[PDB]
Structure formats: C-alpha cells, structure tokens
Symmetry: D2
Subunit: 357 residues, 4 copies
Amino acid sequence: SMDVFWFLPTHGDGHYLGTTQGARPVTLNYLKQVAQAADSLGYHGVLIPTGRSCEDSWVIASALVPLTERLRYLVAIRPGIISPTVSARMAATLDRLSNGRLLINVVTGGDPDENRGDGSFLSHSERYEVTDEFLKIWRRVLQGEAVDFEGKHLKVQNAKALYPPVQKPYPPLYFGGSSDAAHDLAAEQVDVYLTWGEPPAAVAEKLADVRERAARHGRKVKFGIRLHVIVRETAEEAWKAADKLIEHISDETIEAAQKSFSRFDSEGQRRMAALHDGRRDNLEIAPNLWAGVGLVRGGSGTALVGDPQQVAARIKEYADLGIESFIFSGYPHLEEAYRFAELVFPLLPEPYASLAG
Amino acid sequence: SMDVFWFLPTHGDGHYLGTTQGARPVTLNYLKQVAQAADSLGYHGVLIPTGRSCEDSWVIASALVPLTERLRYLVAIRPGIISPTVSARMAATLDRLSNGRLLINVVTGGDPDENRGDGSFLSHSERYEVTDEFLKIWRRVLQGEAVDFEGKHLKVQNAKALYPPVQKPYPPLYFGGSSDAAHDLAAEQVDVYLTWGEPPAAVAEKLADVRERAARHGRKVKFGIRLHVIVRETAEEAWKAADKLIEHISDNLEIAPNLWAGVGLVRGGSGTALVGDPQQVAARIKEYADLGIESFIFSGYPHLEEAYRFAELVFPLLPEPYASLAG
Amino acid sequence: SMDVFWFLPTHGDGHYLGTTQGARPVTLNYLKQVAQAADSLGYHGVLIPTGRSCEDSWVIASALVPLTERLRYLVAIRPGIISPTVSARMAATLDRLSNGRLLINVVTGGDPDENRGDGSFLSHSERYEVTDEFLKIWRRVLQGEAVDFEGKHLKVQNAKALYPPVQKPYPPLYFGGSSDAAHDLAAEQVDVYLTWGEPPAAVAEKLADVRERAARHGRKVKFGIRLHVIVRETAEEAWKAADKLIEHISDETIEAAQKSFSRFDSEGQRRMAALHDGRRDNLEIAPNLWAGVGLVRGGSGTALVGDPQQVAARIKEYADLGIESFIFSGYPHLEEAYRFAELVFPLLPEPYASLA
Amino acid sequence: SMDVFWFLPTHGDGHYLGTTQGARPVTLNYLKQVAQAADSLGYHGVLIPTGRSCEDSWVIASALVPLTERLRYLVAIRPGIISPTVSARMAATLDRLSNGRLLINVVTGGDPDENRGDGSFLSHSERYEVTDEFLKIWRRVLQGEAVDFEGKHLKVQNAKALYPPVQKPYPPLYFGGSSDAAHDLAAEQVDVYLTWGEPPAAVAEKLADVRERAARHGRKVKFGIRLHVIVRETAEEAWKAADKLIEHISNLEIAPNLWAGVGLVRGGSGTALVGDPQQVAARIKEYADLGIESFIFSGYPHLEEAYRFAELVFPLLPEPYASLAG
Ligand SMILES: Cc1cc2nc3c(=O)[nH]c(=O)nc-3n(C[C@H](O)[C@H](O)[C@H](O)COP(=O)(O)O)c2cc1C
Ligand SMILES: Cc1cc2nc3c(=O)[nH]c(=O)nc-3n(C[C@H](O)[C@H](O)[C@H](O)COP(=O)(O)O)c2cc1C
Ligand SMILES: Cc1cc2nc3c(=O)[nH]c(=O)nc-3n(C[C@H](O)[C@H](O)[C@H](O)COP(=O)(O)O)c2cc1C
Ligand SMILES: Cc1cc2nc3c(=O)[nH]c(=O)nc-3n(C[C@H](O)[C@H](O)[C@H](O)COP(=O)(O)O)c2cc1C
C-alpha cells in the first residue's frame, strides 16, 4: 500500500530558492492550477502548510474543495490558538462539503516568536499538554458525544458538534514531531506519524521508537515521510537542476537561515538542520538524498535527486521500513507535479503504475 | 445609496416553521444555488449566520467565493474563541481570494450555554472587554503594524499579518448590539451598526444614540437593519403566506403597519418581517431609509425561491442600481 | 424502470404565457441555475430544445457539462443542415467530456419557413430520406468504421470519427414524430420513441403502431412522453395556478399564434392543435390533462394539473402503457423543478422515492 | 497594439515529436489546465485547431468559456459542412455566454480526403466560392438582416438570427490562405489575415499583396502570424531542446532564429522561433514592424511552455504584456 501526496505552495513559489528572481506569486488562480493538476494526475492528496508565512490553510482548502473531484486535503490544525469545539465544527463542515476528503495535520508550533504573535506563551511541554487536551476534546465531539472536560489548559462544558463528519470515527489524524512529548502524543492519539527526509537509518530508529510506544498503548500507527524531489530523465540533468535551484543564494544568506532555525524550539527542525552545517559543499548526505533545500527553507530540508530508477529505489527503501505515505514537492510546483507523475508513477505500486497512460 | 443583502441558510431551510415537513437540508449544492442566485440577481451580498446550529461560516464562505463574481460575504468572527492574529490572517486570505468581497460581522455570543461549550467562561461585561481588545489588535495587524498588546484579556507580542488585504484599511466591520457597551464599541471601532426589525420609532432612537456617541469620537457610522420579507403581488396573498408559514405552531402578531413578528416564534433568522404587496414593502423600506439606514439584510422561506421573488417584485421600486437590474 | 427529465428553457422563461410580464431572460447564470438544480435534485437529465427561437443547443449543453456531476443532456441534432460526420464528432467530443452523459434527440424540422432559413428546401418525405441517410452514417462512424455511403441526398467517402464515444454503441437516440415516415424511421433506427402529452388512449395506439413496426425490423424500442406539469399541495391550488398561467391571453393572439401552427409541416403539431382549436373554454381534455399551454406555445401543449396523488396517478397510467421516460417542465422552470421534485418524487418508483 | 495568443492542443500533446514517449492525451482536465493557464497569465486568447484529428472545437470552446474570465477563444468555422444560418446562431450564443470573448477563424480545408469524408466534393476554386457565399450570409444575419441569398452553392430564404451577438458588427473574422482566391477573399470580407511563420522577406510580400487588394475595395485589414516557440534562458538550452524534440524521426535553420524542425510532422505551425528572450523578442519586433499585430504562439508541452513564454518574453513585449509579470 502506498499513498503519494503533493504540496500546495501557500507560502510562495518560483524557480529558485532564496532569490526573488523567477518568483511566482500565490493567487487563487495559481492554487487552482496546482490543485487541479494533482487531482487530474492522480495524487492521493496535497499537504497545505500553516504558519505566519502562509495564507490561511482552512480558507485555501475550502476554496479548492468544490473545484476538485478525488483529491484529498491534508489541512493543519494548531491547538492553543483556537477553541477545540470550533475547530471540530470546521473539520466537520469541510469534511461534509468534500464528501470525506479531509485529512488533519496536528501542528504544535515550533517558533516561539510566532506563537507569541498568536497570543500563546507556552513552554515546549505546555504546548504538548495543550495539544493532548485539544485532541481529546476534538476526537470525542466529532463522534457525537456532548463532551465535559476540565484539564490543566482547556475547559469545556457540554461541547457538541451537531453535524457529524463523513469519515469515521473522525478525519484521520496526521502528526509530525521528534521530541519525547511528540512520540508519546503520536503513539496515543494520532493515526499517521510523519517524519522529514532523514537518511534511511535515522528514520528507521524513529519509526521503531514510535512503534514500540504505540504497542504499550495497544495501538498501531502508520507512517509517512516528507521529501522534496528533483527527478529528470537522466542523472546528469537532475544534479544540474539541484545545483541551479540554489545558485542565487549568497553565503551570507545561508548563515542567516542557519541561525534563524536555532530560535525554533523544535526538535524536528533541530535534526533536519543538523544534517547540513551550512556548507555549500558535500550536500549529498546519502545515496540520492541531497540536503541543499534546507539551506534556506524552513520545514523540509532534503530532496531525492536522480533518475527515475534511482528515485523509485529510495522510495522502496523507505517503504520497506514500513512507510506508506509520501509527501513530495518541487520547484516550481505546477511543472514538477507533472514531472514526477510522468517519470516516477509507472515505477511505483498500484494504482500509481496504471495512472500514467 | 442602498445595499440590499440576502441570507444564506447555513442552519437549514424549509417551507414552514416548527415542522420538519418540507425541510431542505443544508448541502454544498443547495448553498451554491442560493449564493449563485443572489450573485446573478444583483444582491450586494449575503449574510452568513454563525453558531452551534450552523455549519462553519468560514468554510462555507471560502467554498462559495470562487463560484461567484460580485456577491459579497458578511462572515462572522467571534472574539474569545480564536486568536485575533489568526482571525486576521483568515480575513486577509478570504479578502484576497475574493478580490475584496469580504465583510466582517462582529459577534460576541449571546448564549452562555453555547459559549461554555466553546471554552469561554466570561460574563456579559467581560465579553465586550474581550471584543474591544480583539478588534484593536485585529484592525492594527491588518494595517501592516507589528502589534505589541497586553490588555486585561488578550496579550500578543510581534503580531503580524504578512499578506495585506484588498479592502483598505481592512474589511468593513458590521456589528449589532443594544447594550451601552455595544453602542460605545460601535461608536469607536465599527463601520456599520446593525439593528433588528423594530418599529420605526424604536429604530430612530437607537440610531440617534449611536450617532451621538460616534460624533464624540469624530467619526460617522452607517446603519443597517435585518428583516424577513414576505412579499407577493397583492396584499391578500402576502398575509395568507404568513399564516401558512406558521400553521404547524402551538399556542395579534402585527406590531406595526406591515411589520409582522411571526417569524420570531422560533429561533430562526430574525424576529420581524415585512408583509405586504410591492408598494407596501418598498414604502416601509423607504421609511427606514429616511432614518439613516443604508444596509438591508433580507431573508425568506425558502431562501432560493424568495430571493427571486423579492428581486423581481421590489427591486424595480428601490433606488439604483436595483432599478436597472430587473431588465 | 423510469427516467424523469426536466427542461432547460432556452426559449426564454417567465411566470405567464403570452405577455412579457414576469419574464425571465435566458442567461448563462440562469441556465446554470436550472441545470444545477436538476442535477442536485436527482433528475435523470434535461431536454434542450432547438430552433430559430432558441439559443444553440450544442453551445449550451457543452457549457453546462463541466458544471454538473450526474445530470444527462438530451441534445438535438438536425439532419439536412449539418454534415453527419461533423455531427458525429461533436457527439463524441461532448460524450467524452461528460463521461457518458450525452443523449441525442433527432429533430427533422417541422417549420418549412425556418428550414428555408437554414438553406434546406425539402418536402416532408425528403426530410425523412435525408434523416434516414444521416442516421445510417452517424451510427456507423461512431462505431469505428471508415464509412463509404452514396445515397439520394448524402454522400461520404472515408468518413471517420477518430475519437470513440463513451456510451456504446453510441449516445442513445431519442426521436419524436407522428407521421408515417416518422414511425418507420423510429422503428428502424432510434432507441426511444417520444410523444407529446395526448390522452392515454391516443398514446397507446401510437405506441402500438411503433411497437408493431419495430418487430418487423427485429427490434424493440422504449417509449417516452413530454408533458408540462402544474402540481400544488391541493387540487384547488393547482387549477388556480393553471388559470393564472393563461390569464393575459387575448383572443387575437390565440389566432395569431395558433394559425402559425397551421403553416407547420408537422403531424405532431397538427394533432396537438387539434385538442383545443383556439377555444379557451373546456381545456381539460382528460382527467387532470389540461391543454391550455398549447394556446400560444408550440411543441408540448398539455400539462398534468392536480395534487401530488392525482399527478402521480396519471404518470402511473402512462407507465402501464410502456412509457419509461418522462420529460417534464414548468413555469417558471427553476421554482417548478423543486416543486415537482419535492411533491411528486416521493410518490414515484425508486430511485426518486428515496432521493429526499 | 499587439495580441499574443496561445494554443489549445486539441489534437494531442507531449514532450517529443514522432514518438509516443512522453505523450499527454487530450482530456477535459488537461484542456482546462492549458486554458486556465493562458487566462491567468494574461494571454489575449487561444487558437483552437479544427479537423479530423481534433476533438470538436465548438464543444471544447463552449465547455471552457464558463471556467475562464478574460481569455478569448479563436474557434474555427468550416463552410461547406454546416449551414451558415446555423453557424451564426452558434457564434451568437457562444459570444453572448462569453460576454464578447469569441473570435472566428474561417477555415476552407486543404485536405481533400478529409473533405470527402465530411460530404464535400468541391475543387479548390469551388471551396472559396462557397466560403465567399458563406461569409456574406453569415455576416449579414449576425447584423440583424433578414437575408435572401441565391448563389452558385448556397441558397437561403428569410434567414434570421434572433439573438444578436455582443461584439459589433460581429465577432472578428480571422483568415489564412496563400492562393489568389484566398487573398481576394481576405481583402473583401475578413478582419485579420493570418500567415505562417515564413522569414520576414516572405511575410512582407504576402502582407503587401493582401493590403494592396484591400485598398481597392476601400477596406483595411490587420495581420497576424502563427509561430511555434522554443525559448529558454540561454540560446544553448533552446537549441538543445530543439534537438531533443525531433530526435526520434527518420540543416534546418532557414533564417536567423527561424527553425523549421517542427514542420517535419503536422501539428500546428511549421517553423519556430528558437533562442533566448532577447533573440525571440527581437524577431517579434521584426515581424511587428511589418504590420503584424496578432501573434499565435505554441510550445511542447503546451502547459509548461505557456508559463515559460509568459515569464521570459512578456516583460520584453509592449504593454499590457510588460506589466503583467508583476
Ligand atoms: C511533515 C511535517 C509537516 C509539518 N508541517 C508544519 C506546518 O505546516 N507548520 C508548522 O508550524 N509546523 C509544521 N511541522 C512541524 C511540527 O508540526 C511541529 O510544529 C514542530 O516539529 C515542533 O515539534 P517537535 O519539537 O516535537 O519537533 C511539520 C512537521 C512535519 C514532519
Ligand atoms: C443584525 C444582527 C446580526 C447578528 N448575527 C448574529 C449571528 O450570526 N450569530 C450570533 O450568535 N449572534 C448574532 N447576533 C447577536 C450578537 O451576538 C449580539 O452581540 C447579541 O445580541 C448580544 O448583544 P447585546 O447583549 O448588546 O444585545 C446578531 C445581532 C444582530 C443585531
Ligand atoms: C419530445 C419532442 C421534442 C421535440 N423537439 C423539437 C425541437 O427541439 N425542435 C423542433 O423543431 N422540433 C421538435 N420536435 C418536433 C419533431 O422533431 C418534428 O420537428 C415534427 O414533429 C415534424 O415531424 P412529423 O410531421 O412527422 O410529426 C419535437 C418533438 C417531440 C415529440
Ligand atoms: C494561421 C493559420 C491557421 C490555420 N488553421 C487551420 C485549421 O485549423 N484547419 C485547417 O484545416 N486549416 C487551417 N489553415 C489552412 C487554411 O485554412 C487553408 O485551408 C490553407 O491555407 C489552404 O488554402 P490555400 O490554397 O489558400 O493555401 C490555417 C492556416 C493558417 C495560416
């Protein structure tokens, strides 16, 4: 089993990273282009990022749902900045309008300055206490229960969501995080645990950690991975495109990005930014696992670079560890969605093998 | 100048009040029908209600924005249950995707049981304190400022909205409320003050109160009214339809000439309705307009059929651009 | 089995017949309203009329196909004014974009003045010769054959439709006509024979004719009926609305419009006007069958008027004669599509009973 | 004035010519992609080809009209296979639903085998006689006249179009053709004369001919050109992409930057502008100096290359195309 997602660039798009040259602004029209492309090409869904640098995830996802037929939308909720009952009603309404195409990404917020901008003044442990109480209220209200809950951070009395969702018991919960609080939270409440594009050995131990903690709770969780991809017909064209992607990045721009990630109280960003020491040389940290993307962009940090057979082999490597969800992205997102679907889909398991043609 | 709104029945629709007979459930398809009808007929916008009995307003408004061309959306934000910075980013995205067709309805929440369900445990006095601090943060972030604010209820540091809205300085703020705290809040921060369909004498005194307080802040606010409408070609058919609307209801409803309080028997949209022929309905509208009312938010049962009825019977009797739309 | 269609008013729409009062002009927005209404309410499809008084059928149906999900479109082809090969390519393209939601209505043209405006100068017998040769080419090209055909009117050499249709062997052919030439054409080539709303006795004899002629060709055809509908919650309200529909109808426009039918070369339009003759009194030619629509409108001329039980009872009577397709319409077309679907659907067979 | 069009690949699309490798089949979803791309990027319109190898132009153009806001559609009418009165009603209906975004491309048909498949058995001279009579009826019915016309090929009596078009007097007529009959037909009835991508010397001679014949009829016509385009950031990548496009086929540069490789197989245009943005814009300015105001471009594949041209060449073109990128 394999689910292949794409990515909506709700923070901006272009041909190069770091520079504003060749930039492609995010508009309703361009978001329709990328979303309808993923829908028509046969992707399972698209991941929509959240944060201060993005347009709002819920407004975007609701606007594109009536314009697509099969595509699913992985939309992020952020506990601590919105009431859980209200968030559940939003999930229910959007899940009903799409007839069951909504997926939820639990995001705790790794930037304390951004959290303070939203009014949240919580430590790392407190963000996960809030998220724990948030998910318990959210999951139960979507199951029709009138929820009474008085915790350390959240308190609701007679919380109800009158419109039940289409997917049962609730829209599936996807979650990413590398700290101990995150691995405990994922093992207890979530349905799919997400990890960034670390080398296969490092992801296998994280999976073994989350999988063991889930067994002590009597649960089993599925796993997913987030990766950029730069695939061409030959390996030579791929590595040239990886070089060209980061050509217009001054050495001073690399250092300023490597030090703005150090303010993030995020263990996931800690590891992803530790794969590269800002060095512009030797960015290939593993066979066909380039790390030059994380030189300037937050969030994801690595990319699969190579020919179609090389990229499909790395996907099978992650899949043999138990990973069943793959969230890909590329620059620019419209052109590269066609590139991946035409070069890599026939090399993937069904139904992606029979989609190309 | 006059703005005529319609109403999106996100809490459900039907032919009769009280009964589940003739009920029409809220789906994407039926919401598309009413909104696209209001867009093509030439209504200025639609009011979208909020509450535990409604689907979420922001999901609905965002889903209908790419399907319409000129229709505006009056969407409700509720302070106390969402961060003001997050609320502003949502307003910016919807205003940008709609190319300036977003309108904001400030709702404080009047039902304490429903507020307790969302996690807010505030008195009536505290609910307006939160709204006051909410709107100050909300207005400033949408104007490009990096906002630092420490109040009695809300606290933000370095709050920014990185995407500026289309409408300047921000999407217009519509607000309704009868308390003294509401009239002070309206005079200081809001752009359009809304009132229910009370008789003309009662509406004139509320307007004079807000208008006097607004002058002390060196500003002027516009006024709007919310009214159900049951208009037919003759006065006899209109009152017959009003009786049919409330037939399956358990035990004098005309509080003013052609102002019927029948639609207030259940917690639906409003509480009073204009009932009569086209000349009678336009005469009551002109009476409210002479008091300073410029926004009219109408509704009917069911909302699709009645949107066409009002636009074809009353629009030619209203000022421009509504006179030249019917043709 | 039963298929219930609605009607797209590409003629124009309104609340009353004869007068421009309460008129509702045909726009893209309003056609989107009616089509999306029929789509969401669960109608099988919509019939789109053709003619000089209509916007083009193919442009409208193609524009609404990407805006609807399940609704089917009964679109008219007119042999004699367009090449059959091109017409087949048009059908294939629209059937592919809709993923198998195209239906074809063969229209031969009953108005000779309108036909001469299109460049066709054919007698009644010749219009059916052209249509017969047209349909033979059209059906075969859509089945993948490179067709050579030399007839009395049409000639093609190496006619091919490179893009195959979704529905096999081709989008179903619906046809209406009352002449003897029409009954032969329907029995030989078409899939569904359509008739206007004549009384049940008269439709049974027309059905018995086509069904007997079809057996001699080794075929069987299904049957459909076209009717207006004025249904309300009570029978008194229905007849009150039927009266109001024709209130602004003067005796001078009855002659001016019904004598326009006297020039039509149509046999289905001849027996339609034979039910009223312009007399406004006594328009209920059968229990709940009311011919007031035919007092100014061409085409359909009768309407089912009554309460939901009465209207559903007349529908079951037509179904017992072998009729499986019902094409309904109402004034105005948006409001009345909801009225019929909410008052009559729960009384009809599945899937219309469980749709609400 | 300058109008820049794109191209809807209703005959099929792909990455390479000759081989089925990298082929992209024509579907509703992919046609929506190309059309909505042209709409958002700011192209004046798209040309839709016609013929036995294409899906029907009128079904495609009508299906995309409600899904776009500003993009215009250059749709082909074919005299001899459809009634002119019927053709005018189609044009009127589509022009009204689009609120004045319809453009008409009159095509007479150069392939006689395909014409016999449609039921037309006419010589070259006869196809232009029919088109002459077709356009006279078509133009007059769209202007509200009750038309009586009896010619060698067409006959109508009381031909009327009850729904008037949005654009007056009618949707503009675009026409392409190189024969003596074609230049006469263009000089008398059409609004824009179209030419293939020949070198500037050859295009100037055809333009001077049509313009001379039009002056004797008291008319003036505008001119347009059809060209494939392979533009990259550098000239080396452009010519390498030109090589890759035609490698799987069993030198080719006919003029400065005018590469005739795309003409080895039929599929829109026969020559292509190949080079960097300054080279491509210089040839565009060179053709514009001859009087050409409409430019119909295409690329392989049509989605990706529509963005490439709009992002690399638009800032080098006159307004409003210079100010669209930002
Ligand atoms: C696949 C994936 C997607 C994520 N998306 C977002 C996002 O959209 N916004 C965000 O603020 N954080 C995002 N994160 C980061 C986490 O949600 C979380 O905020 C951060 O890792 C802090 O948790 P930690 O300290 O346990 O790593 C994402 C993480 C992963 C693995
Ligand atoms: C025109 C108008 C529209 C309103 N819309 C809503 C609504 O959609 N949802 C809601 O919960 N309350 C709505 N309200 C009520 C508000 O919550 C209002 O703050 C409430 O009446 C409490 O104010 P008050 O105590 O000063 O009267 C509306 C009020 C008015 C006048
Ligand atoms: C259901 C139905 C739909 C029809 N639709 C059309 C139409 O759209 N345009 C038209 O000219 N005639 C239409 N007709 C009439 C016939 O196609 C034809 O023009 C007329 O009946 C002449 O045939 P006849 O003399 O054999 O009866 C329709 C007939 C029926 C029964
Ligand atoms: C810009 C342009 C576009 C054309 N498009 C088409 C088309 O879509 N289909 C077609 O069959 N012919 C097309 N043609 C060819 C002409 O319609 C015409 O049939 C051809 O030039 C033969 O006529 P001639 O003898 O005058 O050269 C096009 C020509 C030009 C210049």
